[PDB]
Ligand SMILES: C=C1[C@@H](O)[C@@H]2O[C@]3(CC[C@H](/C=C/[C@@H](C)[C@@H]4CC(C)=C[C@@]5(O[C@H](C[C@@](C)(O)C(=O)O)CC[C@H]5O)O4)O3)CC[C@H]2O[C@@H]1[C@@H](O)C[C@H](C)[C@H]1O[C@@]2(CCCCO2)CC[C@H]1C
């Protein structure tokens with residue numbers, strides 16, 4: 001089987017999809033591995049943290065040219081592997097394939113797009129139809145997404161999730177108590193963790209997205225102190241500079257899809273956390 | 289058939305009197321079975337006709353016939369070789385047509401003067417005055433071998449026929465006559481070069497067909513070398529000047545192409561009077577093909593100006609056009625200029641180079657087209673040997689150091705290629721004092737691709753300076769990274785050891801790198817530990833067997849016990865590939 005995984009990865013690196021048969025296998029084992037992981041997955045540095053990739057496959061290859069190759073460089077992706085980009089299939093499959101091959105070199109969190117309703121509105125579902133010939137590959141992947149960890153904690157200090165803070169979650173234990181094995185709900189803690197956005201207005205605000213909430217500096221400060229965290233590392237929001245600090249540096253947004261939707265002209269960033277948790281950012285333009 | 293000759297025939301296929309190929313080459317031997325008399329009476333006759341276009345066969349037949357004079361009776365009978373050769377000249381696939389002519393030209397010298405007239409010339413005419421055209425495109429190649437040796441009277445006829453071949457109704461017979469007008473010219477007495485060649489030349493230079501005209505440029509080089517300098521202005525230059533002005537850019541292109549040759553054939557004075565302005569026009573041609581060709585000739589041309597007026601024409605007539613070209617729109621042109629522009633240093637001297645060329649040197653070293661800055665970088669030897677390594681370092685270095693640090697990692701990556709070039713060119717003492725630092729710094733760059741490039745770059749530098757230089761100028765600074773708190777750098781250390789074992793030899797690898805590799809087997813980060821297993825696998829073959837048994841086997845075996853899944857996996861693979869398993 002290992003010799004196989006290696007071949008699949010060599011294939012996917014040429015941007016060539018796997019077959020329905022293989023995807024079904026990649027996913028059955030991927031679930032085996034992801035079921036054992038926690039809602040607040042423990043990750044030890046060193047690790048490079050990445051934000052949205054949204055099927056921009058060639059930008060993902062550019063990301064690896066900048067952060068090193070897996071499994072040499074350890075990676076932590078905070079979700080949003082599909083939709084918008086032109087290669088959702090090759091992108092999510094490569095990442096799921098890197099996970100199954102290297103459980104300890106890669107951590108993949110769940111984003112708001114690793115869900116059933118949204119992927120039928122923004123691409124993934126249709127790309128799958130146009131590339132296989134039926135909805136099976138999409139059922140395999142959206143079923144796998146039910147198992148993705150909603151959060152990761154690096155060295156017990158840096159807390160990583162796709163979206164942000166929830167008014168119905170104050171502790172890391174509260175999150176560990178949630179049943180993540182299910183589709184993303186339209187309301188509640190789990191939804192919030194994948195939909196919320198840090199804001200420059202204090203307290204909790206109404207989210208312009210229609211799900212989750214906006215939270216201000218005061219809420220980040222409280223959540224960081226209450227949980228012995230040095231920082232909240234998230235993504236989900238387009239950041240022209242690739243990455244963005246806010247809330248007096250209790251929060252940083254990392255967006256890894258340069259020129260999002262091939263329309264926004266944003267840089268992308270990736271965040272390196274060395275052996276000592278000292279951090280540094282790498283910014284990049286889209287691959288030529 | 290009949291057996292002495294039937295050995296040539298191929299009775300196995302399904303052809304038309306076809307021959308055995310690996311047998312036509314064994315031809316000089318059937319000619320010994322039957323002797324000279326029988327070779328003439330039945331082998332040549334059999335080869336003359338019986339010509340089935342097996343081509344690769346027709347070719348060998350024409351070649352072989354060119355070394356058959358003696359197998360036929362020696363000189364006195366060489367004409368027995370004409371019939372089958374005349375034949376093969378008129379075939380189709382030109383490769384054969386050529387071999388036929390080359391051979392015909394070879395045995396021409398074997399013909400005695402008397403035999404040339406009785407048999408050779410008659411063959412030239414039949415080909416010249418032939419109906420079919422090929423029979424004429426090949427005749428053109430046979431006039432210069434027989435002209436010198438025949439009678440004054442036959443020379444005349446040979447002149448008429450060659451003329452008729454120049455004003456032939458078919459263009460191809462004209463292009464061929466044109467491309468051979470030069471050599472035929474070299475064998476006529478001067479009077480006839482002035483009275484017959486010149487007119488044919490003028491005529492071909494003003495041909496309706498430009499494919500015929502652009503060929504006349506070559507012919508001009510030849511005719512101009514034969515004529516005394518004083519006759520050039522009246523009999524040639526008007527035509528040559530017109531060619532540089534020709535409506536067809538192809539004709540003009542050929543002028544720039546054969547420029548240096550024209551320069552020599554014409555002489556310093558005319559080059560000063562007529563060619564210097566023409567060269568200037570050509571460097572300003574509207575067609576980028578023509579500008580580029582001319583630019584390519586810049587150094588060669590200036591080198592041949594009469595030492596007398598040299599420097600003053602370059603500074604006054606040539607240099608201004610050159611400043612222009614450095615900024616031309618087409619990269620095709622800037623391309624041609626850069627691959628020679630610095631070759632003008634030893635022709636203007638240290639001071640001139642420093643004030644006038646170095647600026648253009650920079651304008652291109654920071655050009656768009658990478659081929660352009662690469663052509664400048666690939667030719668530093670000459671400028672360096674004219675101005676000082678310090679004067680150069682002082683004008684090149686800031687450019688480099690400014691590109692080694694920059695915006696896109698992509699551009700930084702580009703400057704890394706210049707390294708092995710700069711090394712092999714500017715010297716090892718200069719590399720250790722001004723460049724080594726830069727190459728070390730990239731190993732620790734933020735962007736992985738840069739680190740990678742810089743790493744493989746070490747191998748290419750060692751290929752330039754040697755394993756000893758490596759042990760004293762690079763291995764130490766590379767091993768220093770083993771103690772870096774950041775794993776990205778620690779891994780870079782092994783990646784450098786992997787590439788450097790490919791070229792440092794068993795000694796330096798065993799004594800000076802292996803220990804650092806074995807030592808990291810206890811790194812706190814798993815990525816370093818498994819890359820340690822991968823490194824032993826890589827450098828393993830370079831080590832003698834004793835070392836692999838007492839020092840590697842033990843380490844890998846330990847690593848297979850490691851807590852981490854991947855270190856285990858890679859350790860096992862290492863043991864398996866090396867056979868220590
Ligand atoms: C996706 C989103 C939100 O994120 C998005 O947030 C807002 C605020 C910020 C965001 C825009 C960010 C920009 C940088 C991008 C740039 C570009 C070029 C295009 C665009 O792209 C957006 C979608 C996407 C993917 O590209 C993204 O960037 O987000 C849509 C608007 C476009 O201009 O804006 O627009 C308001 C509109 C809102 O629209 C949809 C939202 O209606 C989805 C909806 C709330 C969901 O409800 C459900 C059920 C209830 C629980 C949640 O799940 C089912 C699935 C889905 C219907």
Ligand SMILES: [Mn+2]
Nearest residue numbers: 080111112236
């Ligand atoms: Mn998102």
Ligand SMILES: [Mn+2]
Nearest residue numbers: 052080236237
């Ligand atoms: Mn997103």
